[PDB]
Structures are given as structure tokens and as C-alpha cells.
């Protein structure tokens, strides 16, 4: 047990909630001054109201210096020259987002759903036949990779090779030189193909809109950067949502009962699971001006950690039962996908995967066991996701 603020590790991901509660109740605008590195001080926002408003306010809370509390981030990763879309502010962010958004419509979520369902069924049946097993390795890891592949217009025949690169990158993001090289090489070819054979995906749309046309190397690089953004955005997060939901469901048979009796309640249940798992538990911003929130003034030029995971658990927004699973809650203004300019492009895709996985878990493996104490969590301070979830089926 610890109620003192610290960036999470594999060992402290099981139960960050009391720490968050202490912040919300006693220091909602919390100044962190690392004793070993006081020059790397930063601030932490834990309440729903403050996080909601800060996420929206890109003018005051910029994404352009990076999304971690590490002040050397952009040079450390090698993206200072031209940061990716998630590290762009408007207006730079706006045009590119408009173009790629053409590949994030109901059509793209709908076309991949039968493929998602088929894979979920295949893997859950294998688990059922074997009385359980490694649900993360066999389902919750590979599934989101296929969906990201779909959104990038990777042909189905290349999904296995694409999974290989994805896993190396995801593990490293939590070097991957072979993977980064293979992927950037593969997409160079695919982008070229989309010049003459455009489909309905985000890459096809970027190419059709003339990004990279007429020797615009920088444009082409932006498409390549977007592929890396997608791999890092759409994988560990979904695995976190899926794996993180398992103990929550297991320990509430009454809540499973509600959905067994009314499967049409599953979409609402997905929102509640997204609220409580909040796979992106926090991301940072940089203040562009001094800003006062209550009795605290955050100086210009400092990182501010937006604790989405805490905002999602704030009793001021969701009541004294905010810590509990209620699949009929219908929570509004969840922070799981942030809010404002950078609102997750993959929200509908993530929701669809959760819906299909939950539907089939209840239909195919209703009697299951999860030992929460034996879950292994990934390292990394921003995304909360299991590497392994003990899973037994009777
Ligand atoms: C449950 C799973 C997911 C969670 C919790 C999640 C969370 C988020 C969050 C919090 C942001 C905003 C980042 C910020 O505040 O700076 C974001 C952005 C983004 N996400 Fe997701 N995401 C998920 C799944 C996905 C999927 C499946 C995809 C792709 C199909 C995706 C693609 C993106 C992209 C491209 C952005 C950048 C948007 C922009 O900066 O304008 N995400 N996501």
C-alpha cells in the first residue's frame, strides 16, 4: 500500500486507485518535485472537472513538446524535427486530422467487425476446449493488431508479418530496429501502391488527397509517421481494456447476470469498462502560459500530467460508487479517449472490439475464473495493460 504519488510500474499497476483518491481529495493540482531531479518538476491533475477542461484547452495545454513528464522526450525518441499527429497543436494538427479522419467512419468499423468476431470465436473456443489458458497471448494481444492493420489498409495476407513488427514495437514502446525498418519499408511500398490502387482506408485517403504527391518527401514521411502512431496507439491500449476488464467482470457475477439476461445492455457495459480500465491512465501536456486552477498556479513551461484514470474515477462526477462496476451506469464524459482536438480516432474501433469480446466471453465461456493477484502488468507509466491474465474455463 502507498497513497503517495509516483509514476506507476508493473509492480504498482494492480491498485493505483487509493493514490488517485488521495490526490483528488487532498491535492487536486499536485506539484511533483523528484528529489533526485528537482529540475524535472511537473504537475498532476486528478479531478474530472480539471482534466476535462485541460484536455479541451489545447491553447493553454500544448501537446507539441511531448506527452510524458520527461523534458527530454522528443530528442530521446528522435521526433523533435517533425513530431507525430498526437504531438501537434492546431492549426498544424487540424488539416492532417481532417484528411486521416476520412478513414475513420462507420464504414471502416463495420467492415472489420465480422473478421474480429470470427477471430474472437476461434480463440475463445480453443481456450474453452483446453479449460482455459493464456487469453492475453492468444486473443487480447493479436486481436487489436489485426484491427490496426485494417485501418492502415494492410492486405489480410500480410497481417501475420505485420503482427511480428507490431509486437516488437509495442514491447519497445512500453529499440525495435528490425521492426521499424521492416515496417517503414513495407509502407513505402504500400503508399506507392495506393497512388494507383486506392481503397477506403486512412493511408489510401492521405495518398488520394495528395499528401506526398509531386516529390513531397515530407508529406510521405508524415504518412509513415502516422503508421507508427497507429501501431503505438491502437494495440497496448485495447489489450489493456480487454485484459483489465477480466477481473472486474469476474468478481461481479450480478453484473455478468444482467448481461447474460439482456445482451442488449452490452454497449453500455463497454462504456463502464472503458471508464474503469482507462488503459491510457495519463498523458502529459506543456503549459504555454501561467494558469491558475483553484489555489495553485502552474507556471508556463512545465509538464502537466492529465490523470484520465483518476478523472474517470472521480466521485464528484460519478458519485460515491465511482470505484464500483455498474454496467447500467451509462457514464458520460468519460476521459478514456481524452476530449477535444486529439479525441481518440480509434474510439469506435476500440468500442467494437470490447463489445464483440464481451458478447462472446459471456456466450461461449460464461463459467470462468480469473486470479487477479496473479495478473502480470506491463511496465511503463502511461498505459495500464496486462501481459498475462490467468484464465480458467469450466
Ligand atoms: C481502448 C483502447 C484505446 C484507448 C484507451 C485510446 C486512448 C487514446 C487517447 C487518450 C488519445 C489522446 C492522446 C492524448 O490525450 O494526447 C488517443 C489518440 C489516438 N488514438 Fe486511441 N485509444 C485506444 C484505441 C485506439 C485504436 C484502436 C486506434 C486505431 C484504430 C487508435 C488511434 C488513435 C490515434 C491515431 C490517436 C491520435 C489522435 C490525434 O492526436 O488527433 N486508438 N487514443
UniProtKB/Swiss-Prot annotation:
Cofactor(s) annotated in UniProt: heme
Pfam annotation, one family: p450
Keywords for the protein's UniProt record, in alphabetical order: Heme, Iron, Metal-binding, Monooxygenase, Oxidoreductase
Binding site for heme: 97, 233, 285, 308, 338, 342, 344
GO CC annotation, single: peptidoglycan-based cell wall
Keyword Metal-binding among UniProt keywords: yes
Binding site for substrate: 89, 93
Listed GO MF terms: cholest-4-en-3-one 26-monooxygenase activity; heme binding; iron ion binding; steroid hydroxylase activity
GO biological process terms on file: cholesterol catabolic process
Regulation of activity: Inhibited by azole drugs.
Top EC class, one word: oxidoreductase
Protein EC: 1.14.-.-
Keyword Iron among record annotations: yes
InterPro entries xref list: Cyt_P450, Cyt_P450_B, Cyt_P450_CS, Cyt_P450_sf
Family per similarity comment: Belongs to the cytochrome P450 family.
Subunit structure, interactors included: Homodimer.
PANTHER family linked to this entry: BIOTIN BIOSYNTHESIS CYTOCHROME P450, P450, PUTATIVE (EUROFUNG)-RELATED
Name of this protein: Cytochrome P450 130
Species per Swiss-Prot/TrEMBL record: Mycobacterium tuberculosis (strain ATCC 25618 / H37Rv)
Gene name in the database record: cyp130
Amino acid at each position: 500500500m502507498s497513497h503517495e504519488f509516483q509514476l506507476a510500474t508493473a509492480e504498482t499497476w494492480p491498485n493505483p486507485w487509493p493514490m488517485y483518491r488521495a490526490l483528488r481529495d487532498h491535492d487536486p493540482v499536485h506539484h511533483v518535485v523528484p528529489p533526485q531531479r528537482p529540475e524535472y518538476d511537473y504537475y498532476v491533475l486528478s479531478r474530472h472537472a480539471d482534466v476535462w477542461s485541460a484536455a479541451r484547452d489545447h491553447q493553454t495545454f500544448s501537446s507539441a513538446q511531448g506527452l510524458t513528464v520527461n523534458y527530454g522526450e522528443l530528442e530521446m525518441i528522435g521526433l523533435h524535427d517533425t513530431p507525430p499527429m498526437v504531438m501537434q497543436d492546431p492549426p498544424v494538427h487540424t488539416e492532417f486530422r481532417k484528411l486521416v479522419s476520412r478513414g475513420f467512419t462507420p464504414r471502416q468499423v463495420e467492415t472489420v467487425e465480422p473478421t474480429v468476431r470470427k477471430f474472437v470465436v476461434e480463440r475463445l473456443e480453443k481456450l474453452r476446449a483446453n479449460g482455459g489458458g493464456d487469453i492475453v497471448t492468444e486473443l487480447f494481444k493479436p486481436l487489436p493488431s489485426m484491427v490496426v492493420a485494417h485501418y492502415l489498409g494492410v492486405p489480410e495476407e500480410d497481417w501475420t508479418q505485420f503482427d511480428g513488427w507490431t509486437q516488437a514495437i509495442v514491447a519497445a514502446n512500453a529499440g525495435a530496429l528490425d521492426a521499424v525498418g521492416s515496417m517503414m519499408a513495407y509502407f513505402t511500398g504500400l503508399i506507392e501502391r495506393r497512388r494507383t490502387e486506392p481503397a477506403d482506408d486512412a493511408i489510401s485517403h492521405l495518398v488520394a488527397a495528395g499528401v506526398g504527391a509531386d516529390g513531397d518527401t515530407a508529406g510521405t514521411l508524415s504518412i509513415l509517421a502516422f503508421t507508427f502512431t497507429m501501431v503505438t496507439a491502437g494495440n497496448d491500449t485495447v489489450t489493456g481494456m480487454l485484459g483489465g476488464s477480466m477481473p472486474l467482470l469476474h468478481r461481479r457475477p450480478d453484473q455478468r447476470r444482467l448481461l447474460l439476461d439482456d445482451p442488449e445492455g452490452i454497449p453500455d457495459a463497454v462504456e463502464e469498462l472503458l471508464r474503469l480500465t482507462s488503459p491510457v491512465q495519463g498523458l502529459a501536456r506543456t503549459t504555454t502560459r501561467d494558469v491558475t486552477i483553484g489555489d495553485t498556479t502552474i507556471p508556463a513551461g512545465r509538464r502537466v500530467l492529465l490523470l484520465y484514470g483518476s478523472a474517470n474515477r472521480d466521485e464528484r462526477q460519478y458519485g460515491p460508487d465511482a470505484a464500483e462496476l455498474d454496467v447500467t451506469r451509462c457514464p458520460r464524459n468519460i476521459l478514456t479517449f481524452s476530449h477535444g482536438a486529439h479525441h481518440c480516432l480509434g474510439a469506435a474501433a476500440a468500442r467494437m472490439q470490447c463489445r464483440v469480446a464481451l458478447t462472446e466471453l459471456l456466450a461461449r465461456c460464461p463459467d470462468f475464473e480469473v486470479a487477479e493477484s496473479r495478473i502480470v502488468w506491463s511496465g511503463g507509466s502511461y498505459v495500464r495493460r496486462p501481459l498475462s491474465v490467468p484464465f480458467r474455463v469450466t
